[PDB]
């Protein structure tokens, strides 16, 4: 049951800035690692760490990165000055034995997105679509469709909540979101999700259905000079009650 | 120094056996690792192969090793939809650093027992004028193609498993800003089956 | 000199080969301040404490089933492998010796004299040195310095014979080594 | 028929000295230069027929360094009993005037693996042509070392080999001269 944990899930940073990626490797593990995977690229090694010292490093490492072991829990990777190319999934790993003959336990990953200007960041617009009456009679089932639109970058964690509790059965979300303007390079994204329940379940008006979308944007320390609202890390939701008809 | 895996993506039908290769250096071998990496989850180790020719089994997943030739074969006997993940292989030399391959993205197409294809219209919970089109209950053989127009948005087929009543459904969502868009002409761009039901 | 106290940790991995890779025995040895604390023996199959100090280590290392199964297979993955890597230049190494015969001190005939046969710069250390008076071997009055390891993949030995040389006598040193098919012979006339 | 390959490693404190080497029947196959992080083959021929990843050794030394701290604390800071060496000076082949030869200094049966070795031609230290082996293993867990001096034998010239070790109060000086 022990796991390598990483916070946050996603991260946005302006080009040139210093980024500290936090990791909590398994308590009794002797070797700690850092790996990264650029979109449409292999998972590449960055650094291995044993007994308060770097064991192995990359040619790219040292010039661009540094590692620190402060407390007997945390292990961190530092990006000196962020480049547009540093946008990747950052994996923190750790292995039990000092002989390396054992498996490496991987963290969930931290999707880092480096942008030239934070002016292109937008939170999602969540909306829930009620099932069709034609579906209720034909299949004897009811499909609820959620829609998260106009968000940039792809820093979205969709979740379905039935009666105040998170659900996984009959739930499916798109693995990749679609671009709203496929011609543009810095185009905003759109993502859809489905929740199928029994016709009698949706027909009960006591039953509550909510689609939660966690967005990873800006922080209160980041400078915002634009007219529009600050696109900060926020939760945008949309709800619907059961309809008897 | 260099590890390759082929293919980058692989689609296989539910219940069908599947295999994928991993090519690694033929010299200085210490260990070969296999990781199962699911979407939004952490890559988890399946096998850590250290002995040449030694076969390892973890459920329906078998792995063989040939250190002399520099290859490794992973086999999924009677593949289930839960096996849909990216399978990565890594080569470990004298150190602790792993040299990863491209990884074979496995997508297990579900067996749709009794398919009932249809296109339904969904009303927004807050607005009556806002709607969404849903192409659902079509078998795994039917594919959903992208929209020709920039104002109409169509998502790819997504498999939902209603764990309770033991049911699997394929679904696709479509919406447009321009009101001159209807369900009957929404999914017309794709090869829609003849049995597809349309309401009113 | 340097009065400061020293603390030494020594690690040894012994690969014992009997008739090539036919019979192999691995011996993982942990040594603290010249005293062996704990060891892994492939014949035993698990870590065993030599002294009291090694007791917590034999316990902990035997608890790790990964490391334990890794170590049991090491006779093939590590021992047998490393043998094959070196075999051509290590096992099959053959260096021909330079044989020289000279008296200890120039002494007249019918008087006591010591003859010296110097066998040098050869590999491996297995060498057969025999002394001959006039076709027949002289087993008595022979003194050897023993086999000397030079440290540069060469060996050397000096074999002496106590003699009372006479007019007709033609002494000869016979050297048998795997580098040569036929025995090496260097003769000295009285 | 009977051969032995030994992967011999050590770490020593407070000196912070570590060595890794492979031994085939008493002869060093190769060693790892910790400072240069490179494999050093005893005979240049070996580097042409075999390879070695220096990292494997560097990883092992890191563990040895940690293991030493653990054992130092466990023994309640009990230090190593000094064992003085047995120095022996000899030649590569029989000595012959104006014919190039090699003087060999064999420092043997000692612990810890720290020694100050000086070749002395006519009382003055010599460095030209000098080569040396690493700390070689012994069945009794002591150390072996070899020091080499290429030279041309002369009746006028005299050689010595000064060897300093904490096991001995006064440095061992082994003389050599033509007779």
């Amino acid at each position: 049951e022990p796991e390598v944990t990483q916070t946050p899930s996603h991260q946005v940073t302006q080009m040139g800035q210093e980024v500290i990626l936090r990791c909590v490797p398994i308590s009794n593990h002797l070797y700690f690692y850092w790996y990264r995977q650029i979109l449409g690229q292999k998972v590449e090694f960055l650094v291995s760490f044993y007994n308060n010292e770097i064991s192995e490093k990359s040619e790219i490492f040292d010039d661009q990165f540094s590692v620190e072991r402060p407390d007997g829990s945390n292990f961190t990777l530092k990006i000196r000055s962020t480049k547009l190319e540093d946008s990747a999934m950052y994996f923190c790993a750790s292995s039990r034995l000092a002989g390396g003959m054992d498996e490496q336990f991987f963290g969930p990953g931290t999707r880092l997105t480096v942008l030239e200007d934070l002016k292109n960041v937008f939170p999602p617009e969540v909306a829930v679509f009620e099932p069709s009456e034609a579906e209720i009679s034909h299949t004897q089932k009811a499909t609820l469709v959620c829609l998260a639109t106009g968000f940039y970058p792809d820093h979205v964690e969709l979740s379905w909540w039935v009666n105040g509790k998170e659900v996984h059965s009959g739930v499916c979300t798109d693995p990749q979101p679609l671009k709203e303007q496929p011609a543009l390079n810095d185009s905003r994204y759109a993502l859809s999700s489905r929740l199928r329940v029994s016709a009698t379940f949706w027909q009960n008006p006591r039953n509550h259905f909510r689609c939660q979308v966690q967005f990873y944007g800006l922080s209160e320390n980041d400078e915002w000079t634009q007219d529009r609202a600050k696109p900060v890390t926020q939760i945008v939701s949309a709800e619907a009650w059961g309809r008897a008809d | 120094l260099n590890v390759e895996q082929s293919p980058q993506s692989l689609h296989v039908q539910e219940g069908d056996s599947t295999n994928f290769t991993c090519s690694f250096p033929s010299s200085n071998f210490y260990a070969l690792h296999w990781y199962r990496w699911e979407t939004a989850k952490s890559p988890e180790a399946l096998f850590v192969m250290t002995l040449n020719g030694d076969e390892k089994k973890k459920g329906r997943i078998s792995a063989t090793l040939n250190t002399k030739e520099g290859y490794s074969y992973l086999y999924i006997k009677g593949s289930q939809p839960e096996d849909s993940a990216t399978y990565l292989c890594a080569f470990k030399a004298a150190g602790n650093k792993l040299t990863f391959g491209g990884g074979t993205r496995v997508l297990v197409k579900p067996n749709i027992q009794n398919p009932d294809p249809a296109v339904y219209q969904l009303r927004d919970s807050k607005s009556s004028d806002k709607s969404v089109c849903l192409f659902t209950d079509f078998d795994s053989q039917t594919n959903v193609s992208q929209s020709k127009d920039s104002d109409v948005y169509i998502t790819d087929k997504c498999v939902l498993d209603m764990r309770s009543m033991d049911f699997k459904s394929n679904s696709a969502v479509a919406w447009s800003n321009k009101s001159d868009f209807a369900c009957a002409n929404a999914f017309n761009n794709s090869i829609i089956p003849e049995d597809t039901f349309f309401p009113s | 000199g340097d009065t400061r106290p020293r603390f030494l940790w020594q690690l040894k991995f012994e690969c014992h080969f009997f008739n090539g890779t036919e019979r192999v025995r691995l011996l993982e040895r942990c040594i603290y301040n010249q005293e062996e604390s704990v060891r892994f023996d492939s014949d035993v199959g698990e870590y065993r404490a030599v002294t009291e100090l090694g007791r917590p280590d034999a316990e902990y290392w035997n608890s790790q089933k990964d490391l334990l199964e890794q170590r049991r297979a090491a006779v093939d993955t590590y021992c047998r492998h490393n043998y094959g890597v070196g075999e051509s230049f290590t096992v099959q190494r053959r260096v021909e010796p330079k044989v020289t015969v000279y008296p200890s001190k120039t002494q007249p005939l019918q008087h006591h004299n010591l003859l010296v046969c110097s066998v040098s710069g050869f590999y491996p250390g297995s060498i057969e040195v025999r002394w001959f008076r006039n076709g027949q071997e002289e087993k008595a009055g022979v003194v050897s310095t023993g086999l000397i390891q030079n440290g540069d993949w060469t060996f050397q030995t000096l074999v002496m014979l106590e003699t009372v040389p006479r007019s007709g006598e033609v002494y000869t040193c016979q050297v048998e080594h795997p580098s040569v098919t036929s025995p090496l012979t260097v003769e000295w006339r009285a | 028929e009977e051969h032995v390959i030994i992967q011999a490693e050590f770490y020593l404190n407070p000196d912070q000295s570590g060595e890794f080497m492979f031994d085939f029947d008493g002869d060093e196959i190769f060693h790892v230069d910790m400072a240069k992080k490179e494999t050093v083959w005893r005979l240049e021929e070996f580097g042409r027929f075999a390879s070695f990843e220096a990292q494997g050794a560097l990883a092992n030394i890191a563990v040895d360094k940690a293991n030493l701290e653990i054992m130092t604390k466990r023994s309640n800071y009990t230090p190593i009993t000094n064992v003085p060496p047995e120095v022996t000076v000899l030649t590569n082949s029989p000595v012959e005037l104006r014919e190039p030869n090699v003087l060999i200094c064999f420092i043997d049966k000692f612990t810890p693996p720290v020694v100050n070795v000086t070749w002395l031609r006519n009382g003055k230290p010599v460095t030209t042509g000098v080569s040396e082996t690493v700390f070689l293993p012994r069945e009794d867990h002591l150390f072996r070392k070899f020091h080499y001096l290429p030279f041309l034998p002369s009746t006028e010239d005299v050689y010595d080999c000064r060897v300093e070790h904490w096991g001995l109060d006064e440095p061992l000086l082994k003389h050599w001269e033509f007779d």
Partner: peptide, 13 residues
Amino acid sequence: RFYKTLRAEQASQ
């Protein structure tokens, strides 16, 4: 062909 290192393991603490 490469010479292999039998990897050292850390002692009990």
